[PDB]
Design an enzyme around this catalytic site. Structure first.
Site: not given
Ligand SMILES: [Cu+2]
Ligand SMILES: [Cu+2]
Ligand code: NA
Ligand code: NA
Lengths: 621, 621
Positions: B290, B374
């Site tokens: 990420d 997320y």
């Protein structure tokens, strides 16, 4: 009213009257423990029977007795004489602590050791410590404390800064005799003071901290009924209090829709041990079981509002018995409050456009105890999402010694000439499990690594495995942090909507367990502390991991004798015993009063609910 | 003003103008990363040089460039063409995410797969995921995303409840071509909705939660000067912000009397990886970095007062660049506040009669980011007693799949027909260490058990051992929870009053590290995640554990190539890289939106101070 209500002053007074009238509490008797007994399995419908267990000491040397009385019927149910040389001594009495110093102050061997150190006897405090069991045959069947000396330069001086090393004494507190005085040599007495309220040491106090105001303008979200029954955010439980174990949680249950679902029947810290790692003959004996030997509930602090407990606090004031059976109130002994706990759940979704944030809360139940130089806080937390957590907070003043000039492998130096021996603080949680009822089992869950190959050609797969503990002989388990080892308590007869057994997962901190040699005295007496997890089949008399009489008991009582019965634990009424603790290598920052350190464990639902149980929490006002 | 100040809108505008004037930012160019560079070692006296590093993408297929510019002198310092097939692709662009769905909606292979499932293409959302590196030779040197499909029954429906399993597609986002469509078979699309704001699912909202009001009537105890310099309770630091790493802490130091003592030069989360453990060819490729691939700072949330951050909050609003070089403000992107943290130290002394209680406080700096399903919170805590702690909070919606009828060893079932594949969330903390200055070393500290015998006749002794890591080839370390393994960062040239080196101790949570097979693609790309602790010698260009260009890079960049230089780290300028993470086996309670779970680490002083640093804290008002 509830059979789990707190003992009242009146009940203690009645136990006193019953015992007196029965001839069991004359002037030479002392109550060493008194506590209510839990209701027996499946008898609550109906009829009150409030019963109390009493340990009665005799200060004239006659044998002590274990007595149980019914306060409902005003009768003595049973009265056993105890052979303390076989089954262990009663807990230390508070009046016996102050006998050690007094006797030593007129013993010629003690005075000779002090004279050779140029010490004034009127300045020497003696820490009265439990004795254990070692190689001194004359102590068997005798009530013994050991004393280590510290110097107080003035009545408000912190004596822990001035250990008198090389010297230890043993005293019989019943016959009032000094049995031994051991003087292995003179060490300089550290001279720096350790007085943390002296402006000389603190410097000027900070002016920079601005107040944090925590209020609940509409009062707290929990309610208390019947004295000690709590309802909070779908949780229900009763808060008990025992002079030995301290705070005890009963009937922890969760309101899932319109079903009250049990989780834990009884939760307590059932023992602690504090073993020291200094091989010096002056301290190599020193271990205490604060719960089993001293009774930690007896030394609970009154908790001051805005200092010990901050916010909108509700207090319980438990009642215990003093040594003659009169009631004594521990004012403000238990704090309860709820606390903000940050974000509970949050998601900003690009596709739906919905942004969602909810906040978490925990309810806190706590007390603090002080035993000599040590101060321990016991904290139970209940969270909105079903999580239950325990946390121990360890602070106080470190136990000190001289620091040897050659150095030391087992003591750290905190100040010139001043050492702090290495030690552990180890706890045993006793969780009488009732996941959706009493038919429970325990599984060990390990992560499983998988190998690159057929059906896993990219080598990314991993999995988990669960092993059911079917008999007690199977149920002594070790932590394994590398494989993410956890334990699941489930009910094979109660399933969630996916047809899986409902369960709770116990997450350990995976700290070191008892470090002493497995052949040592302390390893046999604290056998529970050598392993992380034990599971037993429930039994009425199996309450403590070390046995009922820990003071000066020899090896093996309690848990290793329980599991030898090899009882079936697969879908049965079971109890989980979890060992966890701190390994303390003291640091300069622990001196002259130590900042809190913590350890604990938690349990989280694992397929207990049919979905998230906090979908009905509203957005913050 | 400070060279560690936040970038302003004006500086971003100037970088835009410099690049345009230099011919580097025409209409076919896109900025894929822009960030200020830290000052070089020992150059702060004097002269401003604010420099920025830029990654420039070309949407016409020409090679990208790495450019550094000086905003002080208005010049281009250097401009390298990148061979992305060798050193990796640029970070994913935000405008490229929405290209995946659009292209697939007119591809005949995609439409044929949807038709066979009786799915309306206008209802099918496509999650655009980073590609990695596997066996598809045509992807090398091409910019690829992969797409997995979910059904939205209506525009405000939670698509994650309706995964379309058995189907995956690969797209070239530069040439705008669908390279592959893989259809391994039809799975039923789970039908239950997962809409957590629908009263049908939530039931009536609780009315039982009463407000918790947290105010600071005199304002907060910390001050902010120069935009981003914090002073709080003897701590001093600068809060930076980078579009890739998110919040970055600089110059963390502690005021010990009248000496400003450095502890940490730079602290960041320098990478994360989220590997999935499902061997299905539909998902066995799925891993994201990420930080390195998406840039987590770019997706920070605006944090709402009373919802995300409760109390007396101070906000920072960082400025980043959009894809054309215009400044963009992330309003309320960082929360800062102080929090009550229970009891700091407590002791009730029987001998002196003195009762002493002091309360603890922590300062909090946090931000939240959202990437697809997320949501991650990053929390830095500073405590009164010198402790520094990091905590990650993971929430959002779990990534879903179909649940196979035979069952699955790598997916858990959350709802009828609905699965959640097993996965990890792993973080790399980069701690540029400066314990009292830049001459530091690291020791591994293990508990040492001792055997019953001479000099330990009672078998109670235990000890500790410290091993100095002297060269990088030595400095790749594993956790060992059984022996209480910790790591100490000390300065051998700076001693406390006891003549011992000052130090800090890093306490890990000892969670499992990367579980994938060591020969897998992800193990080579996320090599840092296979071990708990790495130490390197400081170097200007060694900023990230995976390298600078993680997107579609092959194995081995970053940490394993840094440590191969085998540099001296014993009393040198060193950097500590700590891997920690969560292993997520999803539970029914994680659905339909998951409660927060946490992981992290802390550092505590270890002989850093000459005594407790909180002796000068006053009693609560
Ligand atoms: Cu300790
Ligand atoms: Cu997860
Ligand atoms: Na049970
Ligand atoms: Na450094």
């Amino acid at each position: 009213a509830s059979p789990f209500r707190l003992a009242s002053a009146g009940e203690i007074s009645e136990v006193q009257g019953i015992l007196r009238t029965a001839g069991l509490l004359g002037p030479e008797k002392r109550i060493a423990y008194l506590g209510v007994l839990d209701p027996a399995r499946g008898a609550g419908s109906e009829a009150e029977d409030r019963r109390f267990r009493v340990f009665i000491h005799d200060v004239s040397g006659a044998r002590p007795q274990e007595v149980t009385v019914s306060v409902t019927n005003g009768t003595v149910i049973s009265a056993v004489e105890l052979d303390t040389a076989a089954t262990g001594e009663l807990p230390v009495l508070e009046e016996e602590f102050e006998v050690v110093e007094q006797l030593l102050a007129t013993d010629e061997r003690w005075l000779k050791a002090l004279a050779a150190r140029n010490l004034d006897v009127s300045k020497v405090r003696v820490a009265p410590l439990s004795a254990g069991v070692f190689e001194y045959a004359e102590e068997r069947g005798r009530r013994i404390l050991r004393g280590l000396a510290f110097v107080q330069d003035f009545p408000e001086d912190s004596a822990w800064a001035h250990p008198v090393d090389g010297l230890v004494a043993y005293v019989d507190v019943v016959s009032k005799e000094v049995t031994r005085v051991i003087d292995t040599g003179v060490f300089p007495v550290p001279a720096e003071h350790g007085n943390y309220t002296d402006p000389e040491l603190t410097g000027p106090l900070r002016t920079t901290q601005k107040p944090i105001s925590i209020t609940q303008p509409e009062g707290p979200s929990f309610t208390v009924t019947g004295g000690n029954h709590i309802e909070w955010e779908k949780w229900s439980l009763d808060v008990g209090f025992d002079v030995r174990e301290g705070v005890v949680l009963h009937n922890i249950a969760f309101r899932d829709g319109d079903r009250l679902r049990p989780i834990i029947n009884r939760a307590s810290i059932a023992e602690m041990v504090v073993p020291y790692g200094d091989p010096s003959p002056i301290r190599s004996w020193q271990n205490y079981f604060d719960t089993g030997e001293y009774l930690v509930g007896q030394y609970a602090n009154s908790l001051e509002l805005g200092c010990d407990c901050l916010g909108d606090i509700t207090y319980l004031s438990p009642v215990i018995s003093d040594a003659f059976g009169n009631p004594r109130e521990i004012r403000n002994g238990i704090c309860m409050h709820e606390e903000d706990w940050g974000i509970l759940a949050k998601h900003s979704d690009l596709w739906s456009g919905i942004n969602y944030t909810r906040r978490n809360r925990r309810m806190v139940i706590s007390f603090f105890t002080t035993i000599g130089n040590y101060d321990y806080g016991f904290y139970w937390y209940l969270y909105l999402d079903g999580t239950i957590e325990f946390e121990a907070k360890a602070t106080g003043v470190v136990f000190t010694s001289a620091f040897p000039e050659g150095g030391s492998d087992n003591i750290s130096q905190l100040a010139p000439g001043l050492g702090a021996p290495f030690h552990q603080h180890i706890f045993s949680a006793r969780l009488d499990m009732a996941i959706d009822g009493f038919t429970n089992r325990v599984e060990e869950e390990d992560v499983v690594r998988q190998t690159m190959g057929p059906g896993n050609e990219r080598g990314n797969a991993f999995s988990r495995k669960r092993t059911v503990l079917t008999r007690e002989s199977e149920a002594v388990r070790e932590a394994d942090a590398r494989t993410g080892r956890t334990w699941i308590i489930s009910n094979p007869e109660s399933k969630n909507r996916l047809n899986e057994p409902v369960g709770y997962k116990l997450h350990a901190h995976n700290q070191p367990t008892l470090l002493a040699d497995p052949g040592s005295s302390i390893a046999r007496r604290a056998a529970f502390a050598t392993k992380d997890l034990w599971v037993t089949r429930y039994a009425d008399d199996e309450r403590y991991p070390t046995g009922d009489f820990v003071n000066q008991h020899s090896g093996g009582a309690g848990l290793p004798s329980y599991i030898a019965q090899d009882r079936d634990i697969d879908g049965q009424d079971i109890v989980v015993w979890h060992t966890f603790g701190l390994t303390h290598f003291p640091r300069v920052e622990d001196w002259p009063i130590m900042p809190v350190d913590t350890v604990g464990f938690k349990l989280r639902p694992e397929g207990f609910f049919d979905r998230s149980p906090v979908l009905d929490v509203p957005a913050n006002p």
